[PDB]
Ligand binder design. Structure first.
Ligand SMILES: Cc1cc2nc3c(=O)[nH]c(=O)nc-3n(C[C@H](O)[C@H](O)[C@H](O)COP(=O)(O)O)c2cc1C
Ligand SMILES: Cc1cc2nc3c(=O)[nH]c(=O)nc-3n(C[C@H](O)[C@H](O)[C@H](O)COP(=O)(O)O)c2cc1C
Ligand SMILES: [Cl-]
Ligand SMILES: [Cl-]
Lengths: 233, 233
């Protein structure tokens, strides 16, 4: 074994926190972990907004779809794509290529996952909040983001006050392909649907996820990004 | 606040030179298991991994990544992909062409990849992300036989390290982390960091990153994604 692996494998989203704050030294370490993430071309295109102002916390909770743990978490971090630093160094920077939004999205996930694992390694718990993107522009303006930047997701951190079971995922032989993409075996989806309702014990996982994707998935996001100068071509 | 997870995170270096020693089957199983334990937006599970063991494809991928020889010499090479094809194979009604979903695919891929890499690093392995595959995304896509609704994002080399670089410094936290609202860049923080990086090595950092972003960044990538059915609106 080792403690990093058991930390990774014991992951659960935590959505209920005690009122205990996170020590100043733990938070410094969590952010230090984030900053040690790999970075495409060393561009360093991620910014983090730490929200301590409780009026802003309450507004973010509402913008995220009334997720109360946005308010009650000890800390709330907002991960943002940031090409404003670069444009402030050299205004010829071309930040509107879709490639650069891919980079900002991937690098944000890498950094955020270092932050979360570092926190979980210390007995803390957390959850990602993609719900900020429901009202992306309102969140953007609330945190004062300039052009060439955009919100991607938030992250709640705190001392956990709940003990969920680990949720199973699709098996590695479904998700991992050897040398070339393998067509899906629908029997593996049926076996996994069974695993999920065992976990949850009417819609099965397969019906829920494809029900969600049959509709429109935040169709305001490309205009939002375009409005900040991003993903225009 | 210091355990071996934190120690692994902060001790991270990109490794680009590997010994010939293979990775044990048990270790690779654990690395992939660690990736599968990552958070997933809405439990969509939008990520696939192609593990490339065929040496001719390894050679081709090395070329397509920009002649990066460690693609070929790494013990294992993993290609991370956005995957909405599992969902469309479940229900052809799924709408996978929203930009929102490429965004989810990219973030979730970085989260999963970083679980894999940290797991590897915790075992004394090393590795490096290979975004260079996107230089030739379409040819890489055809080589791995990806269907519609999937797209490569980046690769990942893993192996037993045969170099030990020093840990490379990042922008300071007080530049990257903002309290409550976005903060303007102080160009003297860039000047300081430019000197910190010049020491690390011997164009400054800021000249190199901006002059790179002054050009076009992989302008073929939006057509690449659109040709796979993604990011069209
Ligand atoms: C990018 C991203 C955004 C997320 N956004 C939310 C959110 O807005 N609200 C929420 O409750 N959970 C959110 N989650 C948490 C997922 O629902 C959770 O990871 C998933 O259900 C699997 O559960 P687990 O993390 O406990 O293993 C998000 C996860 C990711 C990766
Ligand atoms: C998304 C992504 C793609 C990357 N692609 C490459 C690559 O193609 N070639 C390479 O040598 N390094 C690649 N890297 C590694 C970066 O060059 C590296 O993280 C940074 O320059 C080096 O800092 P480090 O030693 O702290 O990781 C990539 C990193 C990320 C996050
Ligand atoms: Cl957690
Ligand atoms: Cl890259």
């Amino acid at each position: 074994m080792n403690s990093t692996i058991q930390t990774i494998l014991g992951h659960r989203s935590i959505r209920k926190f005690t009122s205990q704050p996170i020590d100043k030294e733990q938070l410094e370490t969590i952010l230090q972990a984030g900053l040690a993430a790999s970075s495409s071309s060393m561009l360093q295109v991620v910014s983090i907004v730490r929200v301590t102002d409780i009026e802003k916390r309450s507004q973010l909770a509402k913008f995220a779809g009334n997720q109360a743990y946005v308010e009650s978490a000890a800390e709330f971090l907002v991960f943002c794509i940031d090409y404003q630093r670069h444009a402030s160094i050299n205004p010829d920077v071309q930040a509107d290529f879709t490639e650069l939004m891919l980079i900002g999205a991937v690098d944000s996930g890498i950094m955020a996952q270092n932050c979360l694992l570092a926190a979980e390694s210390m007995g803390l718990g957390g959850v990602y909040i993609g719900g900020l993107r429901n009202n992306a522009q309102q969140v953007d303006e609330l945190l004062g983001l300039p052009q060439n930047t955009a919100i991607l997701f938030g992250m709640c951190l705190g001392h956990p006050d709940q003990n969920p079971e680990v949720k199973p995922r699709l098996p590695a032989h479904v998700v991992v392909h050897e040398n070339q993409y393998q067509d899906l075996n629908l029997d593996d989806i049926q076996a996994y649907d069974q695993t999920m309702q065992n976990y949850y014990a009417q819609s099965t996982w397969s019906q829920e996820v494809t029900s969600k994707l049959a509709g429109e998935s935040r169709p305001h996001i490309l205009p939002y990004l375009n409005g900040k100068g991003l993903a225009k071509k």
